[PDB]
Design a protein around this ligand. Structure first.
Ligand SMILES: Cc1cc2nc3c(=O)[nH]c(=O)nc-3n(C[C@H](O)[C@H](O)[C@H](O)COP(=O)(O)O)c2cc1C
Ligand code: SF4
Ligand code: SF4
Ligand code: SF4
Ligand code: FES
Ligand code: FES
Ligand SMILES: [Mg+2]
Ligand SMILES: [Mg+2]
Ligand SMILES: [Mg+2]
Ligand SMILES: [Mg+2]
Ligand SMILES: [Mg+2]
Ligand SMILES: [Mg+2]
Ligand SMILES: [Mg+2]
Ligand SMILES: [Mg+2]
Lengths: 148, 907, 156
């Protein structure tokens, strides 16, 4: 994208630089926190910060900063390209858009799929993920990662 | 500004957190990680209080007191059952990993964790599993390290790194295995690392100097005294037990050294426990020594002095306002000679003149943390007076606080204030002969001789006012720096200028005076601080005498046939050859001193004076603040044959025996009245502390904790019939517990901080009106002078450029915190810490000779031929040599002098 | 004694201008130095601290906080299996047993000769695919206690 004009000083005519970097860090789960990621990016120990002030007003290096996940940021290109209403109407749930949902564990077909954000958890387990496999019986489940 | 705590309605400052406000109101909330000087971080989670709203929310939410803004419509409840249970469980979690060693902990009855564990009402262990353990480090010869007792409150790291800028202490590990110490064994480099012994709530960092001869806090006997190792009046509270100074603790003073000391003052006290200190007045009958009584000594001294053609006295700049005066009265005003060199005094009375007659406000030690720009012109502030260096370090962080207050960030949220700053500091321009310890924070350091530093200062003062004298020949590369300093000072709303006497130059002092006058003429409320050499240096300058050179001239001439040297060693203020040649040809040499100096070996009489620990008087610090120190213990107790009376007591009784023929041991208040009657400049020392007969509801103030132990057995080996407690007719304190020491007592001289439930240093919260504020009922000090209406003129004398002379080496003063003080260096603890003697050399001038990095070198300054190793100094200007000032063998008077011949060691 | 090579010092200096503060390159400097030598020796702390401009205490705090900045001598091919909830379910225990039965060590130790360190890791973010493990930079999923020997024989 840099060689092709999509990144760099004068991005496609309009004046907007946006140099983009990658920061592959060492392995600590707490650096995933919104305001501990900022500390880790600063080169310090990944300790969270108290809010207020929010990262939006004072964030990365005392400058403003908005920390966003990967899927949230992947959601935006389609919103802009197809329209706001189309994204508003994907399905009739109060959480507009699509979501990456999946079932993990000893199911017949583990993975993740993109679903209309109003799907029942049973519709993922047995229709998509296949269900418990060959002799196993369902006992419980966590919606989302470990920590729910 | 109107909060509701448990139904009650109080009025608070709405600009500070709820922990600060509730502690200022007198309520009791446990807290480990908050410190009224290091802001608030919500780490420990131990100051939880329930917070409601609507005044009718019956189900609040737990929130940390130290992190909530304490605004107007605030409804909290410290005593809520859920809040109580959480606070208790929070200490239980800390107790899960604690080591079963209170009995062997260095701080029992002084530990904050014990206080909070008994406060949260937790006295039952449900934990069953193993505890985590840690290996210790060797942090130096000062403070110990027991990481088993760490509760991870982060106070040490926050103080040491974010406050004092340490750079060699941090936190390591994570996940309940966290660790706080050095990256590797070694001594802690920071000058202000001693404060870790009281900043840390647990017994992780505890000083070794007290750990060797240990005694629990209750057993100690305190008294309000002043640190004597520096020109600042840092208020300490030394503790005594079994007749020897055990430790020196900090004594809050919201105007001088609120919470922190040096290491030179906290650990350099070991010179009072020396076993060679004079303990009885002895006489040298030819070759033999005979111990005298008190009355015998006074009668003999008076009989010999009354037959003298003239008696002169040599007071020191480390005595007290009375001791010097008392002496002045004994010898006549005329015969009193200040025991400092002529040049040591000229630039002391000039600094005093700049402070008094120069219409510029000289800030206190805590008001230094409120100035925008700082210009440390000619002083190694970190090594001479180091608390001023910490204050400057606090002043340079002011821009982060401004950036945070412009974004509506509270002044107690220190993490956000630091994050918003991001290494943005107020301008600070240090200036010295070589590198300093304030270079990491300085915007620019000038490394040059003490003449080029004065030229720089004069150039700044001319660029600011255009009427000050021009330097006439600075070269354009330095002009571009002088220009930055000017642009940064004239733009600052509150600039500070910190010169001093240690630089060894009059031109530096008058250049700083010129800079400060130009700024004041420009409009800014400029302050000016001058660092002197020794405590009570300012008092000697205010009182004044001839000099040491004039005293020696009278001595080696047959004009003066007697001399009384008071608390002076005379070898670090003049040449040790001339001093001995003068004292040799004197038919009487009295030495009133409390140490065993070299001049008392040819002394016809050695009165055993008392140290700061067991003496009463007042010493005036660098801003002219006359503070009074009090006697800690009675030297006679435990040793009946020990006449170690105070210096002013010896001299007053000698003057009485001189005229009267009868001894008169006066009282401290009579001496203070005599001073304020004869020397109008010191009329402010009468108000420095209430005299005797000052009582608090009939009771007099106490020197010992209420539960002081071992009262009928600590003197039983000497005699089983316990003696009467010593009588203190000098001051308002009693050498016993039958006295008063309460937080709400109406006095400002606190021997120690203890409040029921708060055994540790955190008991200082109960003694101040608002925590972190001034001591309730004021702070114990009286400035002698207030800023004048009209200032001095511009000093129209610019020194010529320093051009090195061939075959002569100008001596550049290098001051060390450990070993550069006459008395601290004598402590057997500083022998490990002080550096080895050396002579710094510029590489261009070390290679000019054959000497390389470690080769010994011999040089002659006077009769003496010293031989020191050689260290290469890249920052030192060419035609100079460095020498450790004050360190034994090198008198601080060797600052600006030039040694005439330097060559290899000639082995 | 330790002294920073030219390649790794140049890489650190090139990383130092991707950020507004030089400090921010601390994790990447430690990872560079570890890539070159397999772990971060005690002198690398002070070397990196001198290159960046921050004290050795901060660099040592960063290095001992994060779990993938090794501060102790580690062999080659630092095996890191995953033992988290999704894998615990799929049976990473059999995978750990067959690993520490073949390497003849316990989690946290080198083997004998400086190859095949054994460590547990938080999660490899590849949960739907069996019990996972990383050897050095290769992620191996769908692990079976039968295929641990043949998979270890590929790393010499
Ligand atoms: C302990 C902890 C770990 C977290 N880990 C992640 C993570 O690994 N990935 C992630 O995208 N968000 C993680 N978060 C959530 C972030 O704080 C943040 O809300 C998110 O990354 C970006 O916000 P967004 O969801 O609005 O896009 C974590 C939060 C906490 C408290
Ligand atoms: S630090 Fe305090 S609570 Fe811990 S063992 Fe020492 S005295 Fe007891
Ligand atoms: S060492 Fe002391 S001050 Fe530092 S975190 Fe531990 S308990 Fe707190
Ligand atoms: S700054 Fe001076 S007076 Fe204060 S503690 Fe240090 S040496 Fe003592
Ligand atoms: S003192 Fe408030 S969280 Fe620790
Ligand atoms: S739990 Fe092992 S791959 Fe996620
Ligand atoms: Mg934001
Ligand atoms: Mg406040
Ligand atoms: Mg040990
Ligand atoms: Mg040890
Ligand atoms: Mg360590
Ligand atoms: Mg302690
Ligand atoms: Mg008198
Ligand atoms: Mg007395």
């Amino acid at each position: 994208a840099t060689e092709a004009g999509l990144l760099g000083k004068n991005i496609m005519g309009t004046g907007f630089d946006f140099e983009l970097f990658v920061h592959t860090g060492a392995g600590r789960y707490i650096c995933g926190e919104e305001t501990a990621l900022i500390n880790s990016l600063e080169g310090r120990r990944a300790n969270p910060r108290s809010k207020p002030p929010f990262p939006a007003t004072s964030g990365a290096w005392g400058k403003p900063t908005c920390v966003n996940n990967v899927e949230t940021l992947c959601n935006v290109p389609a919103i802009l390209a197809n329209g706001v209403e189309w994204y508003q109407n994907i399905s009739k749930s109060k959480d507009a858009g699509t979501k990456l949902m999946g079932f993990s564990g000893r199911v017949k077909n583990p993975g993740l799929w993109e679903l209309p954000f109003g799907t029942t958890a049973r519709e993922i387990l047995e229709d998509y993920a296949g269900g418990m496999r060959d002799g196993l019986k369902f006992k419980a489940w966590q919606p989302g990662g470990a920590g729910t | 500004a109107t909060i509701h705590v448990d139904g009650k309605e109080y009025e608070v400052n709405g600009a500070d957190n709820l922990l600060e406000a509730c502690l200022s109101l007198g309520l009791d909330i446990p807290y480990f990680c908050w410190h009224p000087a290091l802001g608030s971080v919500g780490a420990c989670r131990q100051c939880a209080v329930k917070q409601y709203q609507n005044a009718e929310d019956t189900r609040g939410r737990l929130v940390m007191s130290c992190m909530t803004p304490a605004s107007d419509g605030t409804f909290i409840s410290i005593d809520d059952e859920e809040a109580k249970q959480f606070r208790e469980s929070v200490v239980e979690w800390l107790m899960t990993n604690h080591p079963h060693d209170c009995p062997v902990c260095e701080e029992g009855g002084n530990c904050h964790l014990q206080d909070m564990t008994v406060m949260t009402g937790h006295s039952f262990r449900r934990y069953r599993f193993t505890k985590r353990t840690h290996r210790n480090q060797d942090l130096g010869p000062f403070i110990s390290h027991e990481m088993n007792r760490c509760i991870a409150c982060y106070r040490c790291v926050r103080y040491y790194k974010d406050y004092a800028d340490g750079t060699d202490l941090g936190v390591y590990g994570a996940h309940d295995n966290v660790y706080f110490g050095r990256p590797e064994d070694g001594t802690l480099e920071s000058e202000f690392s001693g404060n870790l012994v009281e900043i840390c709530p647990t017994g992780v960092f505890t000083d070794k100097t007290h750990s060797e001869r240990y005694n629990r806090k209750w057993d100690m006997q305190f008294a309000p005294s002043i640190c004597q190792q520096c020109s600042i009046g840092c208020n300490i509270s030394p503790g005594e037990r079994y007749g020897e100074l055990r430790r020196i603790e900090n004594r809050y003073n919201g105007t001088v050294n609120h919470y922190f000391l040096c290491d030179r003052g906290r650990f350099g006290y070991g010179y009072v426990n020396l076993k060679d200190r004079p303990r009885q007045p002895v006489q040298r009958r030819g070759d033999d020594f005979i111990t005298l009584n008190a009355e015998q000594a006074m009668q003999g001294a008076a009989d010999i002095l009354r037959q003298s053609k003239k008696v002169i006295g040599i007071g020191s700049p480390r005595a007290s306002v009375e001791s010097n005066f008392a002496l002045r009265e004994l010898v006549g005003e005329e015969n009193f000679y200040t025991g400092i060199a002529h040049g040591e005094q000229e630039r002391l009375q000039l600094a005093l003149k700049v402070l008094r007659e120069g219409g510029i406000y000289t800030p206190a030690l805590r008001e230094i943390e409120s100035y925008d720009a700082v210009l440390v012109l000619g002083e190694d502030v970190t090594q001479t007076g180091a608390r001023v260096a910490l204050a400057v370090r606090q002043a340079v962080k002011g821009k982060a606080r401004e950036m945070a207050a412009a974004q509506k960030v509270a002044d107690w949220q220190i993490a956000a204030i630091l994050n918003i700053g991001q290494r943005a500091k107020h301008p600070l321009f240090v200036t010295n002969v070589d590198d300093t310890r304030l270079d990491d924070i300085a915007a620019w350091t000038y490394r040059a001789p003490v003449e080029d530093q004065a030229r720089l200062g004069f150039a700044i003062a001319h660029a600011l006012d255009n009427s000050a004298p021009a330097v006439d020949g600075i070269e354009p590369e330095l002009q571009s720096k002088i220009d930055v300093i000017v642009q940064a000072l004239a733009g600052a709303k509150k600039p500070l200028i910190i010169s001093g006497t240690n630089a060894g130059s009059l031109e530096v002092i008058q250049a700083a005076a010129n800079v400060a006058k130009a700024l004041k003429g420009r409009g800014a409320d400029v302050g000016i601080t001058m660092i002197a050499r020794s405590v009570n240096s300012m008092g000697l300058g205010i009182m004044g005498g001839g000099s040491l050179e004039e005293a020696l001239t009278e001595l080696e001439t047959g004009r003066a046939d007697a001399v009384v040297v008071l608390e002076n060693d005379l070898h670090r203020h003049a040449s040790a050859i001339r001093v001995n040649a003068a004292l040799a040809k004197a038919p009487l040499v009295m030495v009133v001193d409390h140490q065993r100096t070299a001049i008392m070996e040819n002394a016809h009489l050695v009165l055993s004076a008392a140290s700061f620990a067991e003496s009463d008087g007042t010493v005036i610090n660098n801003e002219g603040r006359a503070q009074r120190f009090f006697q800690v213990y009675d030297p006679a107790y435990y040793d009946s044959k020990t006449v170690m009376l105070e210096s002013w007591r010896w001299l007053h009784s000698l003057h009485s025996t001189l005229l009267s023929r009868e001894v008169d041991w006066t009282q401290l208040d009579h001496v203070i009245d005599a001073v304020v009657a004869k020397i109008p400049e010191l009329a402010g020392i009468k108000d420095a502390a209430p005299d005797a007969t000052f009582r608090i509801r009939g009771q007099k103030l106490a020197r010992e904790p209420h539960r002081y132990s071992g009262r009928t057995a600590m003197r039983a080996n000497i005699s089983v019939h316990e003696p009467r407690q010593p009588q203190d007719i000098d001051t308002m304190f009693t050498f016993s517990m039958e006295g008063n020491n309460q937080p709400t007592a109406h006095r400002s001289q606190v021997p120690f901080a203890w409040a029921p439930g708060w055994n540790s240093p955190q008991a200082w919260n109960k003694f101040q009106d608002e925590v972190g504020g001034k001591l309730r009922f004021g702070d114990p000090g009286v400035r002698l002078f207030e800023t004048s209406e009209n200032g001095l003129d511009y000093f129209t004398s610019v020194p010529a450029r320093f051009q090195p002379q061939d075959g002569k080496w100008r001596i550049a003063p290098y001051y060390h915190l450990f070993g550069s003080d006459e008395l601290s260096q004598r402590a057997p603890v500083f022998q490990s810490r002080m550096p080895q003697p050396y002579i710094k050399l510029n590489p261009a001038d070390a290679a000019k000779l054959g000497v390389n990095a470690g080769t010994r070198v011999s040089f002659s300054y006077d009769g003496n031929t010293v031989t020191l190793p050689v260290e290469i100094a890249e920052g030192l200007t060419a035609g100079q040599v460095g020498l450790p000032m004050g360190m034994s063998g090198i008198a601080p008077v060797l600052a600006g002098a030039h040694l005439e011949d330097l060559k290899e060691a000639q082995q | 004694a330790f002294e920073l090579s030219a390649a790794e010092r140049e890489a650190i200096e090139h990383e130092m201008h991707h950020y507004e503060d030089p400090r921010a390159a601390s994790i990447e400097a430690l990872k560079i130095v570890q890539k070159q030598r397999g772990w971060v020796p005690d002198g690398a702390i002070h070397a990196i601290a001198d290159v960046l401009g921050i004290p050795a205490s901060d660099v040592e705090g960063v290095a001992t906080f994060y779990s993938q900045i090794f501060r102790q001598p580690v062999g080659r091919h630092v095996i890191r299996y995953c033992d988290s909830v999704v894998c615990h379910i799929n049976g990473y225990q059999g995978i750990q047993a067959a690993l520490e039965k073949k390497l003849n060590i316990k989690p946290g130790q080198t083997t004998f000769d400086g190859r095949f360190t054994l460590l547990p890791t938080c999660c490899l973010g590849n949960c739907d695919k069996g019990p996972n493990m990383m050897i050095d930079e290769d992620t191996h999923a769908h692990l079976t206690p039968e295929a641990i020997p043949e998979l270890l024989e590929r790393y010499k």
